[PDB]
Protein backbone atom coordinates (compact mmCIF):
# COMPACT_ATOMS: atom_id res chain seq x y z
CA UNK A 1 0.00 0.00 0.00
CA UNK A 2 2.80 2.44 0.85
CA UNK A 3 4.29 1.56 -2.54
CA UNK A 4 0.98 1.40 -4.41
CA UNK A 5 -0.21 4.85 -3.36
CA UNK A 6 3.18 6.29 -4.33
CA UNK A 7 3.45 4.55 -7.70
CA UNK A 8 -0.11 5.76 -8.34
CA UNK A 9 0.47 9.39 -7.37
CA UNK A 10 2.14 9.19 -10.78
CA UNK A 11 2.49 6.40 -13.34
CA UNK A 12 6.27 6.53 -13.88
CA UNK A 13 7.95 5.45 -10.64
CA UNK A 14 8.04 2.03 -8.98
CA UNK A 15 9.64 2.20 -5.54
CA UNK A 16 9.94 -1.61 -5.30
CA UNK A 17 12.30 -1.85 -8.29
CA UNK A 18 16.09 -1.86 -8.70
CA UNK A 19 17.60 1.42 -9.90
CA UNK A 20 20.96 -0.37 -10.26
CA UNK A 21 22.30 -0.47 -6.70
CA UNK A 22 24.07 -3.69 -5.77
CA UNK A 23 22.61 -5.35 -2.68
CA UNK A 24 26.03 -5.76 -1.05
CA UNK A 25 27.01 -2.13 -1.70
CA UNK A 26 27.01 -0.33 1.64
CA UNK A 27 25.11 2.59 0.10
CA UNK A 28 22.29 0.20 -0.85
CA UNK A 29 19.14 1.78 0.55
CA UNK A 30 17.15 -0.34 3.00
CA UNK A 31 13.82 0.14 4.76
CA UNK A 32 14.07 0.89 8.48
CA UNK A 33 11.27 1.45 10.99
CA UNK A 34 11.38 4.55 13.18
CA UNK A 35 8.86 4.88 16.00
CA UNK A 36 7.87 7.33 18.71
CA UNK A 37 5.93 5.67 21.53
CA UNK A 38 4.54 6.91 24.83
CA UNK A 39 4.53 3.86 27.08
CA UNK A 40 5.92 2.53 30.33
CA UNK A 41 8.10 -0.17 28.80
CA UNK A 42 9.72 -0.11 32.24
CA UNK B 1 -8.51 -4.03 -2.42
CA UNK B 2 -5.68 -2.01 -3.92
CA UNK B 3 -2.87 -4.59 -3.79
CA UNK B 4 -1.93 -8.12 -4.84
CA UNK B 5 -0.28 -10.96 -2.93
CA UNK B 6 2.69 -12.77 -4.49
CA UNK B 7 4.75 -15.50 -2.83
CA UNK B 8 7.87 -14.57 -4.81
CA UNK B 9 10.37 -17.20 -3.64
CA UNK B 10 13.60 -15.30 -4.34
CA UNK B 11 16.36 -16.81 -2.20
CA UNK B 12 19.05 -16.57 -4.91
CA UNK B 13 22.09 -16.96 -2.62
CA UNK B 14 24.37 -18.36 -5.31
CA UNK B 15 23.99 -15.42 -7.69
CA UNK B 16 24.94 -12.98 -4.93
CA UNK B 17 27.74 -15.25 -3.67
CA UNK B 18 29.55 -15.55 -7.03
CA UNK B 19 29.52 -11.98 -8.28
CA UNK B 20 29.84 -11.30 -11.99
CA UNK B 21 32.30 -10.14 -14.63
CA UNK B 22 31.67 -8.67 -18.08
CA UNK B 23 33.17 -10.13 -21.25
CA UNK B 24 33.41 -9.11 -24.92
CA UNK B 25 32.75 -12.42 -26.68
CA UNK B 26 30.15 -15.19 -26.67
CA UNK B 27 32.88 -17.73 -25.80
CA UNK B 28 35.44 -17.12 -23.05
CA UNK B 29 38.37 -19.27 -21.99
CA UNK B 30 40.96 -19.69 -19.25
CA UNK B 31 43.94 -22.02 -18.83
CA UNK B 32 45.03 -23.85 -15.68
CA UNK B 33 45.68 -27.57 -15.22
CA UNK B 34 48.08 -28.21 -12.31
CA UNK B 35 51.62 -27.99 -10.95
CA UNK B 36 54.21 -30.66 -11.72
CA UNK B 37 54.20 -33.89 -9.76
CA UNK B 38 56.65 -34.69 -6.97
CA UNK B 39 58.36 -37.61 -8.79
CA UNK B 40 59.73 -38.81 -5.45
CA UNK B 41 63.46 -39.40 -5.83
CA UNK B 42 65.39 -36.61 -7.55
CA UNK B 43 68.96 -37.69 -6.84
CA UNK B 44 71.67 -36.87 -9.37
CA UNK B 45 75.21 -37.87 -10.31
CA UNK B 46 76.65 -34.43 -11.19
CA UNK B 47 75.08 -34.08 -14.62
CA UNK B 48 71.80 -32.85 -16.13
CA UNK B 49 71.47 -34.22 -19.70
CA UNK B 50 67.80 -33.23 -19.68
CA UNK B 51 65.10 -33.98 -22.28
CA UNK B 52 63.86 -30.42 -22.96
CA UNK B 53 62.03 -30.47 -19.64
CA UNK B 54 58.74 -32.12 -18.72
CA UNK B 55 56.80 -28.85 -18.59
CA UNK B 56 53.66 -30.22 -20.27
CA UNK B 57 52.01 -26.77 -20.28
CA UNK B 58 48.50 -25.96 -19.12
CA UNK B 59 45.33 -27.02 -20.94
CA UNK B 60 42.97 -24.41 -22.39
CA UNK B 61 39.38 -24.62 -21.14
CA UNK B 62 36.35 -22.72 -22.41
CA UNK B 63 32.60 -22.37 -21.95
CA UNK B 64 29.61 -21.15 -23.95
CA UNK B 65 26.83 -18.70 -23.13
CA UNK B 66 23.11 -19.25 -23.74
CA UNK B 67 20.03 -17.07 -24.25
CA UNK B 68 16.85 -16.56 -22.23
CA UNK B 69 13.84 -14.86 -23.82
CA UNK B 70 10.75 -14.99 -21.54
CA UNK B 71 8.59 -13.14 -24.04
CA UNK B 72 5.79 -10.79 -22.95
CA UNK B 73 2.50 -10.67 -24.87
CA UNK B 74 -0.22 -8.11 -24.14
CA UNK B 75 -3.41 -8.25 -26.19
CA UNK B 76 -3.86 -3.93 -11.40
CA UNK B 77 -4.24 -0.93 -13.70
CA UNK B 78 -1.04 -0.95 -15.74
CA UNK B 79 -0.53 -4.70 -16.04
CA UNK B 80 2.49 -4.16 -18.30
CA UNK B 81 4.96 -3.29 -15.54
CA UNK B 82 3.49 -5.95 -13.24
CA UNK B 83 3.92 -8.76 -15.77
CA UNK B 84 7.35 -7.37 -16.66
CA UNK B 85 8.60 -7.54 -13.07
CA UNK B 86 6.98 -10.97 -12.67
CA UNK B 87 8.79 -12.27 -15.75
CA UNK B 88 12.03 -10.72 -14.51
CA UNK B 89 11.74 -12.61 -11.24
CA UNK B 90 10.86 -15.76 -13.18
CA UNK B 91 13.93 -15.48 -15.40
CA UNK B 92 16.10 -14.90 -12.34
CA UNK B 93 14.67 -18.05 -10.77
CA UNK B 94 15.27 -19.94 -14.02
CA UNK B 95 18.89 -18.78 -14.05
CA UNK B 96 19.37 -19.89 -10.45
CA UNK B 97 17.87 -23.27 -11.37
CA UNK B 98 19.96 -23.74 -14.52
CA UNK B 99 23.38 -22.61 -13.30
CA UNK B 100 23.17 -25.31 -10.60
CA UNK B 101 21.92 -28.05 -12.95
CA UNK B 102 23.99 -30.81 -14.53
CA UNK B 103 23.89 -29.53 -18.09
CA UNK B 104 26.90 -29.90 -20.37
CA UNK B 105 27.82 -27.37 -23.05
CA UNK B 106 26.89 -28.81 -26.46
CA UNK B 107 27.64 -27.06 -29.74
CA UNK B 108 29.03 -27.82 -33.19
CA UNK B 109 32.47 -26.81 -31.86
CA UNK B 110 34.15 -28.92 -29.17
CA UNK B 111 37.85 -28.01 -28.93
CA UNK B 112 38.56 -26.10 -32.18
CA UNK B 113 36.21 -23.26 -31.21
CA UNK B 114 38.12 -20.90 -33.50
CA UNK B 115 37.88 -22.63 -36.90
CA UNK B 116 38.13 -19.16 -38.44
CA UNK B 117 38.73 -20.89 -41.78
CA UNK B 118 35.47 -22.85 -41.81
CA UNK B 119 33.36 -21.47 -38.94
CA UNK B 120 30.20 -23.00 -40.42
CA UNK B 121 30.70 -21.75 -44.00
CA UNK B 122 27.09 -22.64 -44.93
CA UNK B 123 25.59 -19.88 -42.78
CA UNK B 124 25.44 -16.74 -44.92
CA UNK B 125 22.84 -16.42 -47.67
CA UNK B 126 20.20 -18.51 -45.90
CA UNK B 127 20.72 -17.58 -42.22
CA UNK B 128 18.46 -20.48 -41.14
CA UNK B 129 21.20 -22.83 -39.84
CA UNK B 130 20.60 -21.57 -36.29
CA UNK B 131 21.85 -24.02 -33.67
CA UNK B 132 21.08 -23.83 -29.93
CA UNK B 133 23.76 -22.41 -27.63
CA UNK B 134 23.94 -24.45 -24.41
CA UNK B 135 26.25 -23.42 -21.58
CA UNK B 136 28.18 -25.48 -19.06
CA UNK B 137 26.51 -26.12 -15.71
CA UNK B 138 27.85 -26.49 -12.18
CA UNK B 139 28.18 -30.28 -12.01
CA UNK B 140 29.89 -30.30 -15.41
CA UNK B 141 32.79 -28.03 -14.42
CA UNK B 142 33.48 -29.66 -11.03
CA UNK B 143 35.86 -32.32 -12.37
CA UNK B 144 33.08 -34.58 -13.63
CA UNK B 145 33.68 -38.18 -14.70
CA UNK B 146 31.11 -38.52 -17.45
CA UNK B 147 27.78 -37.24 -18.71
CA UNK B 148 24.57 -38.97 -19.84
CA UNK B 149 24.54 -37.27 -23.22
CA UNK B 150 23.75 -33.78 -21.97
CA UNK B 151 23.52 -34.35 -18.21
CA UNK B 152 26.27 -35.28 -15.78
CA UNK B 153 26.16 -38.91 -14.68
CA UNK B 154 25.08 -39.22 -11.04
CA UNK B 155 26.61 -42.66 -10.45
CA UNK B 156 30.28 -42.27 -11.46
CA UNK B 157 33.09 -40.71 -9.45
CA UNK B 158 35.51 -38.28 -11.02
CA UNK B 159 39.14 -38.87 -11.97
CA UNK B 160 42.25 -37.94 -10.00
CA UNK B 161 44.37 -34.83 -10.49
CA UNK B 162 48.04 -35.58 -11.28
CA UNK B 163 49.34 -32.99 -8.80
CA UNK B 164 48.02 -34.89 -5.77
CA UNK B 165 45.72 -37.88 -5.69
CA UNK B 166 42.29 -36.42 -5.00
CA UNK B 167 38.81 -37.49 -6.14
CA UNK B 168 36.67 -34.36 -5.82
CA UNK B 169 33.59 -36.13 -7.24
CA UNK B 170 32.59 -39.36 -5.51
CA UNK B 171 29.48 -41.54 -5.39
CA UNK B 172 28.11 -41.36 -1.86
CA UNK B 173 28.07 -44.61 0.11
CA UNK B 174 25.78 -44.46 3.15
CA UNK B 175 27.33 -47.30 5.13
CA UNK B 176 24.84 -46.79 7.99
CA UNK B 177 21.73 -48.25 6.35
CA UNK B 178 21.62 -51.37 4.12
CA UNK B 179 21.06 -49.21 1.02
CA UNK B 180 17.46 -48.34 1.92
CA UNK B 181 17.60 -44.68 2.97
CA UNK B 182 18.72 -41.97 0.54
CA UNK B 183 20.85 -39.84 2.85
CA UNK B 184 24.39 -38.63 3.49
CA UNK B 185 26.50 -40.89 5.66
CA UNK B 186 27.86 -39.46 8.89
CA UNK B 187 31.38 -39.52 7.39
CA UNK B 188 30.70 -38.87 3.70
CA UNK B 189 31.08 -35.08 3.75
CA UNK B 190 34.28 -35.35 5.81
CA UNK B 191 35.70 -37.46 2.98
CA UNK B 192 34.96 -34.56 0.64
CA UNK B 193 36.70 -32.20 3.06
CA UNK B 194 39.73 -34.50 3.09
CA UNK B 195 39.84 -34.63 -0.70
CA UNK B 196 39.53 -30.85 -0.99
CA UNK B 197 42.28 -30.31 1.59
CA UNK B 198 44.49 -32.66 -0.40
CA UNK B 199 43.70 -30.70 -3.57
CA UNK B 200 43.76 -27.34 -1.77
CA UNK B 201 40.40 -25.75 -2.60
CA UNK B 202 39.79 -23.71 0.60
CA UNK B 203 36.02 -23.80 0.03
CA UNK B 204 33.94 -22.89 3.07
CA UNK B 205 30.32 -22.95 1.81
CA UNK B 206 27.85 -25.78 1.22
CA UNK B 207 24.49 -25.36 -0.50
CA UNK B 208 21.82 -27.94 0.27
CA UNK B 209 18.25 -28.71 -0.72
CA UNK B 210 15.80 -28.50 2.23
CA UNK B 211 15.00 -32.16 1.46
CA UNK B 212 18.35 -33.02 3.10
CA UNK B 213 18.76 -30.62 6.04
CA UNK B 214 17.08 -33.15 8.33
CA UNK B 215 20.22 -35.26 7.92
CA UNK B 216 22.59 -32.62 9.30
CA UNK B 217 19.98 -31.77 11.92
CA UNK B 218 19.88 -35.33 13.26
CA UNK B 219 23.65 -35.62 12.88
CA UNK B 220 23.95 -33.67 16.14
CA UNK B 221 22.30 -36.71 17.78
CA UNK B 222 22.68 -40.48 17.49
CA UNK B 223 21.45 -43.78 18.91
CA UNK B 224 24.70 -45.29 20.22
CA UNK B 225 24.59 -42.69 23.00
CA UNK B 226 27.77 -40.72 22.26
CA UNK B 227 25.98 -37.53 21.10
CA UNK B 228 22.99 -35.94 22.80
CA UNK B 229 21.61 -32.47 23.43
CA UNK B 230 21.03 -30.88 26.84
CA UNK B 231 18.67 -28.24 28.24
CA UNK B 232 19.64 -26.65 31.57
CA UNK B 233 16.38 -24.86 32.36
CA UNK B 234 16.20 -23.44 28.84
CA UNK B 235 12.99 -22.39 27.07
CA UNK B 236 14.37 -23.24 23.63
CA UNK B 237 14.46 -26.24 21.29
CA UNK B 238 17.03 -25.15 18.71
CA UNK B 239 17.15 -27.90 16.04
CA UNK B 240 19.56 -26.64 13.40
CA UNK B 241 23.19 -26.75 12.27
CA UNK B 242 24.98 -24.00 10.34
CA UNK B 243 28.70 -24.77 10.75
CA UNK B 244 31.04 -27.76 10.45
CA UNK B 245 34.75 -28.26 11.10
CA UNK B 246 36.45 -31.41 9.83
CA UNK B 247 39.37 -32.85 11.81
CA UNK B 248 41.64 -31.07 9.31
CA UNK B 249 40.55 -27.69 10.68
CA UNK B 250 38.51 -26.54 7.66
CA UNK B 251 35.39 -24.60 8.58
CA UNK B 252 32.29 -24.93 6.41
CA UNK B 253 29.19 -22.73 6.49
CA UNK B 254 25.91 -24.31 5.43
CA UNK B 255 23.21 -22.51 3.46
CA UNK B 256 19.88 -23.76 2.10
CA UNK B 257 18.63 -23.21 -1.46
CA UNK B 258 15.37 -24.63 -2.83
CA UNK B 259 16.53 -24.38 -6.47
CA UNK B 260 18.94 -27.32 -6.30
CA UNK B 261 18.29 -30.89 -7.48
CA UNK B 262 17.25 -33.13 -4.60
CA UNK B 263 19.70 -35.87 -5.65
CA UNK B 264 22.84 -33.79 -5.22
CA UNK B 265 24.77 -31.53 -2.85
CA UNK B 266 27.31 -28.84 -3.73
CA UNK B 267 30.50 -27.44 -2.20
CA UNK B 268 30.78 -23.82 -3.36
CA UNK B 269 33.33 -21.05 -2.86
CA UNK B 270 33.02 -17.33 -3.53
CA UNK B 271 36.00 -16.52 -5.74
CA UNK B 272 36.30 -19.90 -7.48
CA UNK B 273 33.03 -19.22 -9.34
CA UNK B 274 32.23 -16.19 -11.47
CA UNK B 275 29.21 -15.25 -13.58
CA UNK B 276 30.12 -14.03 -17.06
CA UNK B 277 27.55 -11.84 -18.82
CA UNK B 278 27.50 -10.44 -22.36
CA UNK B 279 24.01 -8.98 -22.89
CA UNK B 280 22.26 -7.42 -19.92
CA UNK B 281 18.48 -7.75 -19.46
CA UNK B 282 16.95 -5.33 -21.96
CA UNK B 283 13.26 -4.51 -22.38
CA UNK B 284 12.64 -4.16 -26.11
CA UNK B 285 10.72 -5.47 -29.13
CA UNK B 286 11.45 -7.52 -32.25
CA UNK B 287 12.12 -6.22 -35.78
CA UNK B 288 9.95 -3.86 -37.85
CA UNK B 289 3.07 -4.57 -30.05
CA UNK B 290 5.01 -7.06 -27.91
CA UNK B 291 7.73 -6.72 -25.28
CA UNK B 292 10.55 -9.13 -24.50
CA UNK B 293 13.72 -9.75 -22.49
CA UNK B 294 17.03 -11.17 -23.67
CA UNK B 295 19.88 -12.04 -21.30
CA UNK B 296 23.13 -13.59 -22.55
CA UNK B 297 24.96 -15.24 -19.65
CA UNK B 298 27.67 -17.85 -19.20
CA UNK B 299 29.29 -19.79 -16.39
CA UNK B 300 32.97 -19.69 -15.44
CA UNK B 301 34.90 -21.78 -12.95
CA UNK B 302 38.46 -21.09 -11.85
CA UNK B 303 39.51 -24.73 -11.45
CA UNK B 304 37.50 -27.99 -11.59
CA UNK B 305 39.23 -29.74 -8.68
CA UNK B 306 38.49 -26.78 -6.37
CA UNK B 307 34.73 -27.08 -5.90
CA UNK B 308 33.14 -30.38 -4.96
CA UNK B 309 29.93 -32.26 -5.70
CA UNK B 310 28.44 -35.37 -4.12
CA UNK B 311 25.58 -37.46 -5.48
CA UNK B 312 23.09 -39.10 -3.13
CA UNK B 313 21.84 -42.57 -4.05
CA UNK B 314 22.39 -46.27 -3.41
CA UNK B 315 24.96 -48.24 -5.36
CA UNK B 316 23.64 -50.68 -7.95
CA UNK C 1 46.64 1.15 -7.27
CA UNK C 2 43.21 0.57 -8.82
CA UNK C 3 42.77 -3.09 -9.71
CA UNK C 4 41.41 -4.14 -13.08
CA UNK C 5 39.03 -6.60 -11.40
CA UNK C 6 37.56 -3.69 -9.43
CA UNK C 7 37.06 -1.80 -12.69
CA UNK C 8 35.42 -4.83 -14.31
CA UNK C 9 33.01 -5.22 -11.39
CA UNK C 10 32.26 -1.50 -11.60
CA UNK C 11 31.62 -1.80 -15.34
CA UNK C 12 29.20 -4.68 -14.78
CA UNK C 13 27.33 -2.88 -12.01
CA UNK C 14 27.14 0.34 -14.02
CA UNK C 15 25.96 -1.51 -17.13
CA UNK C 16 23.11 -3.20 -15.27
CA UNK C 17 22.21 0.08 -13.56
CA UNK C 18 22.10 1.87 -16.91
CA UNK C 19 19.96 -0.93 -18.34
CA UNK C 20 17.43 -0.60 -15.52
CA UNK C 21 17.47 3.20 -15.70
CA UNK C 22 16.84 3.13 -19.45
CA UNK C 23 14.08 0.54 -19.19
CA UNK C 24 12.38 2.79 -16.65
CA UNK C 25 12.99 6.26 -18.09
CA UNK C 26 11.88 5.24 -21.57
CA UNK C 27 8.28 4.40 -20.68
CA UNK C 28 8.34 6.97 -17.87
CA UNK C 29 9.17 10.07 -19.93
CA UNK C 30 10.13 9.56 -23.55
CA UNK C 31 7.03 7.65 -24.63
CA UNK C 32 5.09 10.79 -23.72
CA UNK C 33 7.70 13.32 -24.86
CA UNK C 34 7.75 11.95 -28.40
CA UNK C 35 3.99 12.31 -28.86
CA UNK C 36 4.10 15.70 -27.14
CA UNK C 37 6.66 16.93 -29.65
CA UNK C 38 4.54 15.46 -32.44
CA UNK C 39 1.52 17.40 -31.17
CA UNK C 40 3.73 20.50 -30.96
CA UNK C 41 3.65 20.69 -34.77
CA UNK C 42 0.31 18.91 -35.12
CA UNK C 43 1.78 15.88 -36.89
CA UNK C 44 0.34 13.14 -34.65
CA UNK C 45 -3.34 13.34 -35.72
CA UNK C 46 -3.18 11.55 -39.05
From TrEMBL, chain A:
Organism: Escherichia phage vB_EcoP_SU10
Identification of the protein by name: Portal protein
Residues of the full protein shown: 258 to 299 of 747
Automatic annotation (TrEMBL), chain B:
Pfam families: SU10_MCP
Full protein name: Major head protein
Organism encoding this protein: Escherichia phage vB_EcoP_SU10
Lineage per the UniProt record: Viruses, Duplodnaviria, Heunggongvirae, Uroviricota, Caudoviricetes
Amino acid sequence: QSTVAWSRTDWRQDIDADIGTDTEDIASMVWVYEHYIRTGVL
Amino acid sequence: ANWISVLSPQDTPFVSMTGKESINQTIFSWQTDALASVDGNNAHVEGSRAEDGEMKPTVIKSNVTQILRKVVRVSRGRELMYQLEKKGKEIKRDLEKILLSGQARTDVLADQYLTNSAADPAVAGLNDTHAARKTGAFQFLCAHGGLAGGVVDKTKNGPADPDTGAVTVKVAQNASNPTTNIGFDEADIFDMTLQLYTAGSEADIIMINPAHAKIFAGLQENTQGSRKRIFENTKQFIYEVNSITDPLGQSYKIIVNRWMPTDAVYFFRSADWTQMVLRAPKRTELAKEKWMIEMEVGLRHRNPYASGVLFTAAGK
Amino acid sequence: KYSEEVLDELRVDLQRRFNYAQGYVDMAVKGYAREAWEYFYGNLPA
